[PDB]
Amino acid sequence: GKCRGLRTARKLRSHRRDQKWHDKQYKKAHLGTALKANPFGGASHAKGIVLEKVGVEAKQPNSAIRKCVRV
Amino acid sequence: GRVRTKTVKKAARVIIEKYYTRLGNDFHTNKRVCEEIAIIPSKKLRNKIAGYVTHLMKRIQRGPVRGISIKLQEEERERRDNYVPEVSALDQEIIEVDPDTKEMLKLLDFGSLSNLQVTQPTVGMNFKTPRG
Amino acid sequence: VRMNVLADALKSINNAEKRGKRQVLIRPCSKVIVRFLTVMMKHGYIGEFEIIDDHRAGKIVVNLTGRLNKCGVISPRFDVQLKDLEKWQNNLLPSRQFGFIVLTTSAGIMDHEEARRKHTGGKILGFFF
Amino acid sequence: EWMPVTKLGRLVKDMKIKSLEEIYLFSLPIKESEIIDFFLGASLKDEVLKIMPVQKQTRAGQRTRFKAFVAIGDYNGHVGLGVKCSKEVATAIRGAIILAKLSIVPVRRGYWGNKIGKPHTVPCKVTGRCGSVLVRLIPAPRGTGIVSAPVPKKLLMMAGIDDCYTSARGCTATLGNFAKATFDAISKTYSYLTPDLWKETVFTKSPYQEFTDHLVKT
Amino acid sequence: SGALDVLQMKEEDVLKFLAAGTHLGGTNLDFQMEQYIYKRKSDGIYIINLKRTWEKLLLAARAIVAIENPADVSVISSRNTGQRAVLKFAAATGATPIAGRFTPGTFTNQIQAAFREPRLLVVTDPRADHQPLTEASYVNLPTIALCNTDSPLRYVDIAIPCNNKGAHSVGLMWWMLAREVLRMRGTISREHPWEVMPDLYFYRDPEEIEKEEQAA
Amino acid sequence: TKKRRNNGRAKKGRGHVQPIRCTNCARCVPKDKAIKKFVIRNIVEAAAVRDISEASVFDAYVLPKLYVKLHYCVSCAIHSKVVRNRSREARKDRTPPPRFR
Amino acid sequence: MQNDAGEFVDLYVPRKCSASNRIIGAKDHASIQMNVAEVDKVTGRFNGQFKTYAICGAIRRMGESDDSILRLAKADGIVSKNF
Amino acid sequence: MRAKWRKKRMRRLKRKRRKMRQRSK
RNA sequence: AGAUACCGUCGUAGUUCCGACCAUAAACGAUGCCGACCGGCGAUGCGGCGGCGUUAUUCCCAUGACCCGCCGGGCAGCUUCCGGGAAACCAAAGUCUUUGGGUUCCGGGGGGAGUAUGGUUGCAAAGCUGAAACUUAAAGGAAUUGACGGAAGGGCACCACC
RNA sequence: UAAAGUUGCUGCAGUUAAAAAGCUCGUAGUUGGAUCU
Numbered sequence A: 001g002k003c004r005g006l007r008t009a010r011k012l013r014s015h016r017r018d019q020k021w022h023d024k025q026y027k028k029a030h031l032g033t034a035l036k037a038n039p040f041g042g043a044s045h046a047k048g049i050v051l052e053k054v055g056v057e058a059k060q061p062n063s064a065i066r067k068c069v070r071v
Numbered sequence B: 001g002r003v004r005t006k007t008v009k010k011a012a013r014v015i016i017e018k019y020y021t022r023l024g025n026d027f028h029t030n031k032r033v034c035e036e037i038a039i040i041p042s043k044k045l046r047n048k049i050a051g052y053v054t055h056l057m058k059r060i061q062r063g064p065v066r067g068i069s070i071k072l073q074e075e076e077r078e079r080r081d082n083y084v085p086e087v088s089a090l091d092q093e094i095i096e097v098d099p100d101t102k103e104m105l106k107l108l109d110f111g112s113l114s115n116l117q118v119t120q121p122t123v124g125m126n127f128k129t130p131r132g
Numbered sequence C: 001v002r003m004n005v006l007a008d009a010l011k012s013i014n015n016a017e018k019r020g021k022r023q024v025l026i027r028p029c030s031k032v033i034v035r036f037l038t039v040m041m042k043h044g045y046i047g048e049f050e051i052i053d054d055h056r057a058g059k060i061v062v063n064l065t066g067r068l069n070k071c072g073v074i075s076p077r078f079d080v081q082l083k084d085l086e087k088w089q090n091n092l093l094p095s096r097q098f099g100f101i102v103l104t105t106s107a108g109i110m111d112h113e114e115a116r117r118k119h120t121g122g123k124i125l126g127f128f129f
Numbered sequence D: 001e002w003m004p005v006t007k008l009g010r011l012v013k014d015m016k017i018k019s020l021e022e023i024y025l026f027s028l029p030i031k032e033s034e035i036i037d038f039f040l041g042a043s044l045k046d047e048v049l050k051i052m053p054v055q056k057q058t059r060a061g062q063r064t065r066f067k068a069f070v071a072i073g074d075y076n077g078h079v080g081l082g083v084k085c086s087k088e089v090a091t092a093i094r095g096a097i098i099l100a101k102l103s104i105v106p107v108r109r110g111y112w113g114n115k116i117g118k119p120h121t122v123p124c125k126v127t128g129r130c131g132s133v134l135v136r137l138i139p140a141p142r143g144t145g146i147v148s149a150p151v152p153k154k155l156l157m158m159a160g161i162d163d164c165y166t167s168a169r170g171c172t173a174t175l176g177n178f179a180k181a182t183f184d185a186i187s188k189t190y191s192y193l194t195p196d197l198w199k200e201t202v203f204t205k206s207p208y209q210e211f212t213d214h215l216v217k218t
Numbered sequence E: 001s002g003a004l005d006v007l008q009m010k011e012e013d014v015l016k017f018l019a020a021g022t023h024l025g026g027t028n029l030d031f032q033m034e035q036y037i038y039k040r041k042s043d044g045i046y047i048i049n050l051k052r053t054w055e056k057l058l059l060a061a062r063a064i065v066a067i068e069n070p071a072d073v074s075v076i077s078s079r080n081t082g083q084r085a086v087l088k089f090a091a092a093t094g095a096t097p098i099a100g101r102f103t104p105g106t107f108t109n110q111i112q113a114a115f116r117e118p119r120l121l122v123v124t125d126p127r128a129d130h131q132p133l134t135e136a137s138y139v140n141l142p143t144i145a146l147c148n149t150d151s152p153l154r155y156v157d158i159a160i161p162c163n164n165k166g167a168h169s170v171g172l173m174w175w176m177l178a179r180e181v182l183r184m185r186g187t188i189s190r191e192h193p194w195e196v197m198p199d200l201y202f203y204r205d206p207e208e209i210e211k212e213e214q215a216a
Numbered sequence F: 001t002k003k004r005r006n007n008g009r010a011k012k013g014r015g016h017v018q019p020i021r022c023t024n025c026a027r028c029v030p031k032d033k034a035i036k037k038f039v040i041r042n043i044v045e046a047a048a049v050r051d052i053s054e055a056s057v058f059d060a061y062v063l064p065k066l067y068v069k070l071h072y073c074v075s076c077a078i079h080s081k082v083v084r085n086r087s088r089e090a091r092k093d094r095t096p097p098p099r100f101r
Numbered sequence G: 001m002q003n004d005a006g007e008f009v010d011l012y013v014p015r016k017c018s019a020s021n022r023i024i025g026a027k028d029h030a031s032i033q034m035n036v037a038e039v040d041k042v043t044g045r046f047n048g049q050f051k052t053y054a055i056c057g058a059i060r061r062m063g064e065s066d067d068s069i070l071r072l073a074k075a076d077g078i079v080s081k082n083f
Numbered sequence H: 001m002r003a004k005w006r007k008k009r010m011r012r013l014k015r016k017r018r019k020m021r022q023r024s025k
Numbered sequence I: 001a002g003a004u005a006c007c008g009u010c011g012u013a014g015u016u017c018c019g020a021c022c023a024u025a026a027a028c029g030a031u032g033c034c035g036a037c038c039g040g041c042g043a044u045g046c047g048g049c050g051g052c053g054u055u056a057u058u059c060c061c062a063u064g065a066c067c068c069g070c071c072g073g074g075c076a077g078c079u080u081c082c083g084g085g086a087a088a089c090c091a092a093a094g095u096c097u098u099u100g101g102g103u104u105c106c107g108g109g110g111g112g113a114g115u116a117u118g119g120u121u122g123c124a125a126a127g128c129u130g131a132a133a134c135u136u137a138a139a140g141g142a143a144u145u146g147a148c149g150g151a152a153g154g155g156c157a158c159c160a161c162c
Numbered sequence J: 001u002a003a004a005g006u007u008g009c010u011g012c013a014g015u016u017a018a019a020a021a022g023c024u025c026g027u028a029g030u031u032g033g034a035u036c037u
């Protein structure tokens, strides 16, 4: 079980600090790889130049052609 | 097969319960009584019911049956069940007891009984089935 | 090894109370245990108890009345100020009409209400209700 | 017309029992639905909580039945819950109503602080379990209201509780278990030994023993 | 018996117990049937304390008498050895007898033909009449049992430590219980022996019936 | 989902048990797990008994018996029908079948 | 139980088990309310007075109702002291 | 694919890489 | 059909011993250790204690072999509405919303992946530590009713056979 | 940020759903039986 001593504050805090890294969202927010890989770089919006128009096929079981743009 | 369906058996049992006095061991008299007392809209069904009533009456005459019980039969069984011997089987001039039983009686200040006779206990203590 | 004697005694008392027993044997004895039992008895939860005195640490036989729902211990013994008592009362007690938190203060071993009356803090030992 | 088939029903019909608390005192099981109608009467209101289709796989195909959850109460200290599964919805609802009013328990109400006026909250913290669902009821100050999910709130209101705090753990998406856990938690209020119930109990004549001569006649 | 001299056990009752063998138990002992035992002799047979048996019988009689309507007491026997004793007890006292098979749902299924609501239950063997015992827990029914050295005591309130194996012992126990109930009611007197002998409650054993039929 | 409490073998309070060889297929199987069968039979069959008793030079000469210890793995025991599958409640019963008449 | 004004505010007062002091609930169908008759010390007939005991179903399931009833009767003097 | 054979395939691929991806290179 | 397999004949490392490496297994009770409390029953192994009676040491104690009990550790078994749990089941997997005896390791939806890279150990095979980009709305546990089985046992039929 | 008792000190889990090191020793750390008015 967990240690319940009166002088175990360092152990508890260190263990929690180390086990927070096994949370997907905490590690994603605090590691920096996701921010580097994000094309917007953390911005809510961005401006671009339309390279072309494309059509993406909808995944099954739906059938359609979604109109998109490469920018 | 000649197994009787539950309709015939139920009707026969009810008829024997209600009219035990009027019935007997004759199939034809039984089938004449059945049409008198019961309403059977078929001749073959009446014959089957009468033929089962005769068999059941013979079985009753042989002895008690697991199913129906007649009021007269119940009253006669009461008389057979009030059988009483002239003397009590519990009355014995000598009753054999073990020394431990005598000690238990003595602890209840009943060690002065004259009917008691102390018997020698068994020398060997072997009362278990041999494991194997 | 055994490191808390009050915890073992309270666990034994609670287990015997759940089973409907009339008497409980708790060993080893301790004056902290005697104070806790006296505090419980003053409120009518257990009843009279007898200390059997062998030449090593003693034993206690406690009579039960069936009025005890839960008696427990808090480990470690946390320092409780007089302004933080209400939080422990909310966390540990079932209602505000009954139940007691047991504290060891500089005046002695008592309940939380008696410590409020005497205006003193201390260390929490356990609770019962 | 009502023709009782049990001794308790005959006693209730012949006006030998004053209140349902007499039956609750002796923990006598209730087997006839007409007793509750006789005592609680018009104060009872019911509400359908869920209609759930269940299916049994057969050789030709699935066979479907419908299960109704019905909660009932008089908003003045009594509450009951019933579950009934049938082929048709209406039959299941009628059966659920009957089964809910059959299993009606009283509710004990207490105070949070100063004991002034009528009781408004639960006497203490009470816990109920059903499946993986755990429900905890905590006393609340007057005027707080019921702080809970929609499903337990209906049962708490029908019981007559005005103020209460609620905690819940487990898969509460199972509506049946969620309702049964809080029903058990509510039922546990009269089973808790508080210090004000420490007085020795004075026994009284049981209705079976008290009215035996009248029962012999009928 | 609250130490009253009138309720004390007499010598003739002790002789009847010794003749019937009610003091002889089994080789196995139940851990909750140990306060009524006296001592285990050789061959593994346990001996029952007859004074405690008398005390339990008197307590059961007091419990039975307290019921106003005699028909509210049900006496049940499943084994053949106890059926005649139960029938005679019901005839002499006014209780309701159930001899033979007990139909499940008798106390719970209210739409059956044999549905009943007894106020007290008396059984001959907890291990053989377990079905009526289990249904007692559903309808708040106190139970009285004739237990042995090895017998479970779940749902049993008043246990009478007798020998429930032999026919003579069972018949004697039922006869004495009926006698005590009648004497407490104020029907027969304690000054003279009861008119009926305890052999009317014994099992017939149709082998004995055949032997007696050909006696003359 | 455990199927048996004893894991289908008789190993208690020890780590390893030496393996033996199946009589039928020569598979390696732990000794405690294997199905054992002790066969005591007659060398000569029923008809051979009467045929031989007349041709013997001795009087009331008792024919010798054959004693064999057979070990089977689970697959061979099931296939040879010396062991069969049972109901979930009947698996617990470990009394040998009533071969004694 | 009662408010500050002293008025009692409860639907009913449940009875407690005589053996274990536990509360017997409204849905406890294994509980027993048994009566034991009192006899006259001179004649031994039914006095008309009785003593009432109540046992909860938890004790009965434990098979401890026999001993509890025996002790209750001994305490009340119904059973002889030299039992 | 059985996990044992998948592990064996991964090990063989790693050995092939190690032979091709020489430390000298 | 095809066998580079299952089957059969041979047969190399190996299988055996000594000295150096390797440290991995469904290395499993898939269940960390220490301590307290909480129901019954019958066996079993070791030690000790008590007690009628059979046997051997030709006599005697005494000591071995049996028999009936008690105590303490140990491997287990049966039963129970002690209580738990999603259940299967568990006298521990209990004494948990009535949540705190001490302490170590360790998990955070499914894949990518125990992979890449760095470090370290090894002669090698490999061992230890150990990601991310990206992708996905489920994957999975226990139990229930059906349908199937080149699974077991019964039953019936001249649209089956004899 | 709460919802998240899905980072659990209050307050989570580790037989089968993710999980207890193959086993033992052992320093630091944590914890430690009664008794003195």
Ligand SMILES: [Mg+2]
Binding pocket: none
């Ligand atoms: Mg992902």
Ligand SMILES: [Mg+2]
Binding pocket: A061, A062, A063
């Ligand atoms: Mg579509």
Ligand SMILES: [Mg+2]
Binding pocket: D173
């Ligand atoms: Mg959900």
Ligand SMILES: [Mg+2]
Binding pocket: none
């Ligand atoms: Mg499987």
Ligand SMILES: [Mg+2]
Binding pocket: none
């Ligand atoms: Mg070992």
Ligand SMILES: [Mg+2]
Binding pocket: F015, F016
């Ligand atoms: Mg191994």
Ligand SMILES: [Mg+2]
Binding pocket: F008, F009, F032, F033, F034, F035
């Ligand atoms: Mg095997």
Ligand SMILES: [Mg+2]
Binding pocket: none
């Ligand atoms: Mg490993």
Ligand SMILES: [Mg+2]
Binding pocket: I028
């Ligand atoms: Mg293993």
Ligand SMILES: [Mg+2]
Binding pocket: none
């Ligand atoms: Mg492992």
Ligand SMILES: [Mg+2]
Binding pocket: none
């Ligand atoms: Mg042992």
Ligand SMILES: [Mg+2]
Binding pocket: I045, I046
């Ligand atoms: Mg050993």
Ligand SMILES: [Mg+2]
Binding pocket: none
């Ligand atoms: Mg020994």
Ligand SMILES: [Mg+2]
Binding pocket: I096, I099
């Ligand atoms: Mg916890």
Ligand SMILES: [Mg+2]
Binding pocket: none
């Ligand atoms: Mg993951």
Ligand SMILES: [Mg+2]
Binding pocket: none
């Ligand atoms: Mg979709």
